[model samples]
Target chain A: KNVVIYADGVYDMLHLGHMKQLEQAKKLFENTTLIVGVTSDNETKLFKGQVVQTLEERTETLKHIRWVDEIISPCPWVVTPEFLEKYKIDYVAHDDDIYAWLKRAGKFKATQRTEGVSTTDLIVRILKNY
Target chain B: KNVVIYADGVYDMLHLGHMKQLEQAKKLFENTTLIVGVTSDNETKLFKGQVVQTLEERTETLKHIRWVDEIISPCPWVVTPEFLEKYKIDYVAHDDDIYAWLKRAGKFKATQRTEGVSTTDLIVRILKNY
Candidate 1:
């Protein structure tokens, strides 16, 4: 059976950390297709802020990344059984502690989060300079 | 007066190379405010093909990066005196040879590009996996 791995996030910053996560997701299965679900701009704006880039910009940025195969632009912020079935996703790969619910559901495949670099850290660094 | 250093690019698939360039640019002046000018989607599509991530996403990603102080969404691909004046830019920083005109015009400051990391290389890697 052809295996497809799925990951989801706002992917706003498009940093090395995000790259590392995608790289780890691809390594889980040989010749696997990795589909990323990017949260909608409206959703991200509410959660993140009246901030940097928009959904169109973020989608374009991800399209250029090496590890990304297919993208679900304005992907649902929350996972549902319907979401998995719609995408034919075999596994949901993520590293954040907030996603522990997926693990309990036996649908999650853990990927390593990049250390020392994070969206929150980047915010702190930006604030330090301000 | 606050020194505002400017940088411009497609910045698609944000990577280590971009990070390194911004790091170098930030070090050039004390307490520098680094403003990034991201190219518009239409221009990038014409030059780069119908590809990944959108302009808004790219801008959001850049806004989250540690070195970025501000961003010009859908920024003109070509630099103009008006652009500089509008943003109060002091110098334009970039590492690509394509921007040699900025150097000749004395509007540019060179930054070091990270070795072995580029948008083109990432595309090749993605293709290899396909």
Candidate 2:
């Protein structure tokens, strides 16, 4: 039995930058399940320093997506020991931070390597040209 | 000048059951400021026994609505005096409970009357024959 868990930020303006990476991750797991742990609107304002949409707006949009199994709006951040323990998550998946923390803490049992795309570049391109 | 604060639930299936009510509510005030305070998923599960959508998805969809100006996801319920005070809300708008608690507490300055439609009926109609 394989339990692969993933957490994420606001899929608010969910661009292709995220879509491609998530598709790749899904391919890695044999028994595939993806739980998207989103930051709350308050946390998005306070911590993430961005508020593109409301919490319900964010949740409803994610639920419609075919790939996602469940969406969790975890306050604070997703790197908590409690989240790993509570979800009984065999593996934790994310970008950037996982390389530094979850892997080091040995909190996440397995890993999925991601090929990063420049979402910032996409935003910049759209703003400059289109 | 009237500041009308409207708080609501899921708006999940995003049906005309709500659209008509909101259109009528918007017509009442000369200076209408409708702030929709959404109930969080955890709170919804605990109290309402419903989990139609997650927080962010709900927020994003509402953002696209032209009528909804600002949306607030107040963790518990929208009844607290703190929410009323913080938004500087002149009047709290809701159905059923409005005639009871809000009027008795003397919290709302002005009252707006609205006719009821069966959202329950709408949901059943969709699922039964659609």
Per-residue error (Å), model 2, residue A96: 2.4
Q: Candidate 2 lDDT, tens digit per residue, B1-130?
A: 7666665666543433354445544454677877776778888878777544457655654554435667886534546667667678666655444346667776444433333323334334435744
TM-score of chain B of 1: 0.80
Where's the lowest-lDDT run of ten residues in candidate 1 chain B?
A: B117-126
Model 1 per-residue lDDT tens digits across residues A1-130: 5678998987765666787788888678887889998888788778765434567666766765657789998888788888888888888998856667667877789887766454445435545755
Candidate 2 positional error at B102, Å: 53
lDDT of 1 by residue, B1-130 (tens): 5778988888876666786687788777877888888888899888866535568767766754657778778888788778788887888887756667667777788888776555455445545755
In order of appearance, the predictions have TM-scores of 0.47, 0.42
Over 4 Å off, model 2: A74-76, A97-99, A105-130, B1-130
- What alpha-carbon RMSD in Å does predicted model 2 have with respect to the real structure? 18.5
In terms of TM-score, the best-performing candidate is: 1
TM-score, chain B, each candidate: 0.80, 0.72
| C-alpha lDDT of residue B126 in model 1 | 41
Cα lDDT of model 2 by residue, A68-128, tens digit: 6777875346467786677776666555444466777764433334233233333343357
